């Protein structure tokens, strides 16, 4: 037996009313699939929503251990195994996901074969194992038939665009997604919908459309029970307040910290968000990571040093950053820091060039403000705000 049902039965031995409560939590309306789920090996619910909801309600502290054991014992050819692939990927449970993928790439069911091959492209592209060109080409050769993988072939490109600081293609690409075409798997539909809500929050942020960015993150939060999506919602809401509301931006990042304390990756992301917030407002910064050579962390060391007129130490750190390789959005930030250190207008125009190239209409407010402080003509600033990149 799978650990999940062992624990569910030993707990129903001690309390019988758990039958009606688990049926309501899973949305079943009557315990008939519940009884079947506990009495014959291999029986699956109609929607993966059912098992996830019981696990989160009854054993929240044990979700990963229970779902890892339940997922990796599923018939890879089934709907349940295809839902578990999404559950795993959405949660960044990479070790569940990669086992399921090489398992479904191998089987004989064509739907599971497809999911596996597409999620594999997403993972290889996520890890810079393949370029975007070879991912698009490989996706084309798959002749993707299911609406779920037609939606996810586009989602995986969207995530790659967001992570490489290449925002201009995202708005038109996300418009191509129609999740109403997903009718066979309500759990994949509902989770993809959360995915789109959070991606739309990031796109609205990148367009400086801050009210809409916050509404989309709030809809993601009401739509989900998955920690990864709550994390990125609080992160994006907080980012949207960076230039206007210190206390509310901090409050959202601290709420993010509070829900991700057992997750080193998400905990690090909120420290980094609080680190940037405090540098934008030029306050004492207790969130700096002095033991890192990532561009993100090094940039913030330099920013804080500049803010407190320690120009030598900022020069040391910026010397480090010259010997690392930047993408477009990181380079725009690099020129912003160089301009503040050097008091050099040319650095601020190069900063603007690359925020234009990345299509970042939000962080561009940083070099724009510095140019205004140095007396740049207001008509020129308006023009830079208005023109765009090819």
């Amino acid at each position: 037996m799978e650990l999940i049902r062992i624990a569910m039965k030993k707990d129903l031995e001690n309390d019988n009313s758990l039958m009606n409560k688990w049926a309501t939590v899973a949305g079943l309306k009557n315990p008939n699939p519940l009884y079947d789920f506990l009495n014959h090996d291999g029986k699956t619910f109609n929607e993966f929503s059912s098992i996830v909801n019981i696990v989160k309600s009854q054993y929240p502290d044990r979700e990963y251990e229970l779902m890892k054991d339940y997922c990796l014992n599923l018939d890879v050819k089934t709907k349940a195994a295809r839902s578990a692939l999404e559950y795993a990927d959405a949660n960044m449970f990479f070790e569940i996901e990669d086992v399921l993928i090489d398992s479904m790439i191998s089987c004989s069911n064509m739907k599971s074969k497809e999911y596996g091959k597409v999620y594999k492209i997403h993972r290889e592209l996520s890890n810079s194992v393949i370029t975007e060109f070879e991912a698009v080409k490989r996706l084309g050769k798959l002749n993707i038939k299911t609406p779920e993988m037609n939606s996810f072939s586009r989602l995986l490109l969207l995530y790659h665009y967001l992570s490489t600081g290449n925002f201009s293609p995202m708005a038109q690409l996300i418009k191509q997604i129609d999740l109403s075409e997903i009718s066979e798997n309500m759990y994949i539909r509902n989770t993809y919908q959360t995915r789109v809500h959070v991606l739309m929050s990031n796109i609205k942020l990148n367009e400086n459309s801050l009210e809409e960015c916050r509404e989309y993150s709030k809809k993601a939060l009401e739509s989900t029970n998955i920690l990864r999506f709550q994390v990125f919602s609080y992160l994006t809401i907080g980012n949207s307040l960076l230039f206007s509301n210190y206390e509310l931006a901090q409050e959202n990042f601290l709420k993010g910290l509070s829900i991700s304390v057992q997750n080193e990756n998400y905990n690090m992301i909120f420290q980094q968000a609080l680190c940037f917030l405090n540098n934008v407002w030029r306050k004492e910064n207790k969130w700096i990571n002095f033991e890192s050579d990532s561009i993100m962390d090094l940039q913030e060391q330099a920013h804080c040093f500049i803010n407190f007129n320690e120009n030598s130490k900022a020069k040391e750190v910026l010397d480090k950053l010259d010997l690392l390789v930047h993408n477009d959005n990181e380079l725009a930030m690099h020129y912003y820091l160089k301009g503040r250190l050097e008091q050099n207008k040319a650095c601020f125009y190069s900063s603007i060039e690359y925020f234009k190239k990345s299509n970042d209409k939000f962080l561009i407010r940083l070099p724009l403000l510095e140019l205004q402080k140095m007396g740049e003509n207001q008509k020129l600033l308006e023009l830079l705000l208005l023109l765009e990149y090819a």
Partner: peptide, 6 residues
């Protein structure tokens, strides 16, 4: 820089 994610 500013962290971003979805």
């Amino acid at each position: 820089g500013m962290p971003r994610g979805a």
